[PDB]
């Protein structure tokens, strides 16, 4: 791939790519019925997607890793132009007509399965865009989409641009680290300025032992843009509902869910309700523990005790539970996880699990000197499967979160030969230095294992059509394979393969490993019940008509979480996911995680966590199809039955 492109070349290549690609769509869009064929219509569009995707990825990737701001800025602009172009092509009624004609002309069952799936998806995407509907319906949909887009931009911008802050004395900030306190904007008043941004909010609620301070900050944070965003949310709900009906669905949720593994809003509601019921007892147990800790602390500090867990007590006491009930010293633990050792052990586990051998391509071209390129080859034949880059250390201008970027999609070229997948994994682990090793927290090891899992999905998939390549699966299933893989960082054998004291070379003591593993369950009951409250609010707003966001959230917090929403607040008005493309899909996080445990326990825990036979079945049944098969079908084959919540519940001790 190309990595030495300047900002100017990016600009030029983008215009050229769009011109060349549009040329193909124009050709397809003007065919006469008589000339419509599999080769001239379906293959034409499938082939151009391959050439386009490759080029598009090269142009929009630099914005996330290039050390050059000019290149990054040009890449961001190219992404905007290409994204706009993608939507423009998706709405082409002329091209859609030829696809519909092809569907008519195509003899039933005469196409290869994946080709038939591709044709059906193209037809479905057009229908979800309303291209088959009457002009008046399409005009109305267009109008509503425009409004919705604007409403979403404001919802997010309002929250992001907010600069609300609360002044507190060093005494009121009791509990927060010293380095934290001096980082605040010291007012002439003498008080320190605490803003509602995450870097300030989370640490304060988890460490500040002054109840009134937590209370004030919680009220403010959960009341941000209350009036404006609640008005916007009411409009989003109504407009989404109308748009969904015009597109043929009874609710927005049902429209959104059609493409998910869950399929319908009823399926999601049943999923969430059953999960909440099963987790209830664990929630009761956890709140009892927290209430006692609060009673004890209030007594100890001479503070009044109201006998109730408040919204502003949650994060604080959950943190206390973790520190005094499970303990586990991350400071000591991290000494056994030097980044170099984790990388080696991690790559070792994946090699063995998938029957692969990773080969470092010394001195390969890259966007930064610290980037390393590897070629994954079949362990017995040595044939190339794919390639992947590792860009693990922080630097100015680089994406600040761990992620997997598909660069070259694994699929078939125009001539029928196979194009290998090429992906890049990004992380931001401190880079080892002279006398300052880079020790990883367990959560970083978890994130590392999770993201590399996506790299393997990208590389091991063998779809023939670019549309189904790699991680292009149902949104509520894409995370399941990686979440299944996270289980490895909670198992002793794999953990030992990824650890070693950075200095003494000693192995992690069994006592420490046991505690670490036990800590996985800390506060899991309340953590999940809260996620359920969020998922249910998301579902209610996109299935009901008169549902009031604040009231729904309050009702659910009391009934499911057991911790009341603070009067006057409106958490839903700050719930960015409702305006970030995840609308009606928040349940997806819980859905993938719950079933990922079924995948893990049913196959890997019974046949051998590091057994290659199971690993090869995982590669074959789950990764190889890419989006060429429905997640439900892949799971049924891998599990031998449909998935259940059982494994998840058992892992919680239920």
**d(C-alpha 604, C-alpha 601), whole Å:** 6
Residue with tokens 């006592």: 511
**d(C-alpha 8, C-alpha 435), whole Å:** 41
* Choice between 57 and 482, CB closer to Zn ion: 482
In whole angstroms, how close is the CB of 593 to Zn ion at the nearest point? 11
* Cβ-closest position to Zn ion: 482
Query: Which stretches of the chain bind Zn ion, using CB under 5 A?
Result: 479, 482
* Choice between 279 and 473, CB closer to Zn ion: 473
How far CA 278 is from CA of 76, 441, 484, 522, 616, in Å, comes to 46, 31, 21, 17, 33
Q: Which contiguous run of DSSP H or E holds residue 74?
A: helix 69-90
Looking at 49, 114, 451, 464, which residue is catalytic?
451
With beta carbons less than 8 A apart as the criterion, state whether 64 and 127 touch: no
With beta carbons less than 8 A apart as the criterion, state whether 121 and 188 touch: no
In whole angstroms, how close is the CB of 334 to Zn ion at the nearest point? 23
Residue with tokens 């039933």: 108
Q: What b/e string do you get for 455-494 counting C-beta neighbours within 10 Å, with b at 16 or more? A: bbbbbbbbbbbbbbbbbbbbbbbbbbbbbbbbbbbbbeeb
Q: Which contiguous run of DSSP H or E holds residue 225?
A: none
In whole angstroms, how close is the CB of 222 to Zn ion at the nearest point? 27
* Choice between 60 and 479, CB closer to Zn ion: 479
In whole angstroms, how close is the CB of 618 to Zn ion at the nearest point? 16
Q: What is the DSSP letter of 508?
A: P
> Widest CA span of the chain, in angstroms?
87
CA-nearest of 352, 258, 424, 368 to 610 is: 352
With beta carbons less than 8 A apart as the criterion, state whether 195 and 223 touch: no
Cα R_g (the chain), whole angstroms? 26
Q: And the tokens for 515?
A: 């505690």
* Choice between 129 and 482, CB closer to Zn ion: 482
* Choice between 482 and 531, CB closer to Zn ion: 482
CA-nearest of 349, 354, 615, 388 to 498 is: 349
* Choice between 211 and 481, CB closer to Zn ion: 481
**d(C-alpha 314, C-alpha 293), whole Å:** 11
Residue with tokens 């911008």: 157
In whole angstroms, how close is the CB of 471 to Zn ion at the nearest point? 9
With beta carbons less than 8 A apart as the criterion, state whether 254 and 264 touch: yes
**d(C-alpha 372, C-alpha 362), whole Å:** 8
In whole angstroms, how close is the CB of 442 to Zn ion at the nearest point? 17
* Choice between 168 and 449, CB closer to Zn ion: 449
The answer to whether 457 is a known ligand-binding residue is yes
- CA neighbours closer than 13 Å in the CB half-sphere of residue 119: 26
* Choice between 114 and 479, CB closer to Zn ion: 479
In whole angstroms, how close is the CB of 403 to Zn ion at the nearest point? 8
Beta strand 403-408 with 411-412 is unpaired
228 in catalytic set: no
In whole angstroms, how close is the CB of 451 to Zn ion at the nearest point? 6
**d(C-alpha 459, C-alpha 137), whole Å:** 42
Catalytic residues, which ones? 451
Annotated binding site: 450, 454, 457
Annotated binding site for Zn(2+): 450, 454, 457
């Amino acid at each position: 791939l190309r990595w030495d492109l300047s900002a100017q070349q990016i600009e030029e290549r983008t215009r050229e790519l769009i011109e060349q690609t549009k040329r193909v769509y124009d050709q397809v869009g003007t065919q006469e019925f008589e000339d419509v064929s599999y080769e001239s219509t379906l293959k034409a569009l499938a082939d151009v997607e391959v050439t386009y995707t490759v080029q598009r990825n090269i142009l929009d990737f630099p914005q996330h890793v290039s050390p050059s701001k000019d290149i990054r800025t040009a890449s961001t602009e190219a992404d905007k132009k290409l994204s706009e172009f993608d939507v423009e092509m998706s709405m082409r009624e002329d091209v859609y007509q030829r696809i519909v004609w092809l569907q008519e002309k195509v003899q039933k069952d005469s196409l290869r399965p994946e080709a038939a799936r591709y044709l059906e998806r193209l037809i479905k995407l057009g229908r979800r865009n309303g291209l088959h509907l009457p002009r008046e319906t399409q005009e109305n949909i267009k109008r509503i989409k425009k409004k919705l887009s604007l409403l979403c931009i404001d919802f997010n911008k309002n929250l992001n641009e907010d600069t609300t802050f609360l002044p507190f004395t060093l005494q009121e900030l009791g509990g927060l680290p010293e380095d934290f306190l001096n980082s605040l904007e010291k007012m002439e008043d003498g008080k320190l300025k605490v803003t509602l941004k995450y870097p300030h909010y989370f640490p304060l609620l988890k460490k500040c032992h002054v109840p009134e301070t937590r209370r004030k900050v919680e009220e403010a944070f959960n009341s941000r843009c209350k009036e404006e965003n609640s008005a916007i949310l009411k409009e989003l709900v109504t407009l989404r509902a109308q748009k969904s009906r015009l597109l043929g669905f009874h609710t927005h949720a049902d429209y959104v869910l059609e493409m998910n593994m869950a399929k319908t809003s009823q399926t999601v509601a049943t999923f969430l309700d059953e999960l909440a019921q099963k987790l209830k007892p664990l929630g009761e147990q956890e709140r009892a523990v927290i209430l006692e800790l609060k009673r004890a602390e209030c007594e100890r500090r001479g503070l009044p005790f109201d006998g109730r867990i408040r919204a502003w007590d949650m994060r604080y006491y959950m943190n206390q539970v973790e520190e005094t009930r499970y303990c586990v010293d991350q400071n000591l633990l991290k000494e056994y996880f030097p980044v170099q050792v984790v990388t080696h052990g991690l790559l070792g586990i994946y090699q063995e699990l998938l029957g692969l051998a990773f080969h470092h391509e010394e001195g390969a071209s890259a966007w930064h000197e610290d980037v390393r390129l590897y070629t994954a080859r079949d362990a017995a034949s040595g044939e190339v499967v794919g390639k992947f880059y590792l860009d693990l250390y922080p630097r100015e201008g680089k994406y600040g979160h761990a992620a997997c970027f598909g660069l070259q999609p694994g699929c078939l070229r125009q001539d029928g030969s196979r194009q290998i997948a090429i992906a890049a994994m990004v992380a931001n682990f401190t880079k080892p230095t002279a006398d300052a090793p880079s020790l990883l927290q367990h959560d970083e090891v978890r994130t590392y294992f999770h993201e590399f899992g996506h790299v393997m999905h990208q590389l091991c998939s063998q779809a023939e059509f670019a549309m189904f390549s790699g991680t292009h699966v149902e949104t509520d299933f894409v995370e399941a394979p990686s979440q299944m893989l996270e289980n490895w960082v909670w198992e002793q054998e794999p953990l030992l393969r990824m650890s070693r004291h950075y200095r003494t070379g000693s192995a992690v003591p069994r006592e420490l490993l046991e505690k670490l593993i036990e800590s996985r369950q800390a506060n899991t009951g309340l953590f999940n019940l809260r996620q359920i409250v969020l998922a249910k609010v998301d579902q209610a707003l996109h299935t009901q008509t008169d549902a009031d966001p604040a009231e729904e959230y309050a009702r659910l917090c009391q009934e499911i979480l057991g911790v009341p929403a603070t009067p006057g607040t409106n958490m839903p008005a700050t719930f960015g996911h409702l305006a970030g493309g995840y609308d009606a899909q928040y349940y997806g996080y819980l859905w993938s995680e719950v079933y990922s445990m079924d995948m893990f326990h049913t196959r890997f825990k019974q046949e051998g966590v590091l057994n290659s036979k199971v690993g090869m079945d995982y590669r074959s049944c789950i990764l190889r199809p890419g989006g060429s098969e429905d997640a439900s079908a892949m799971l049924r084959r891998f599990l031998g039955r449909d998935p259940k919540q059982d494994a998840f519940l058992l892992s919680k001790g239920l």
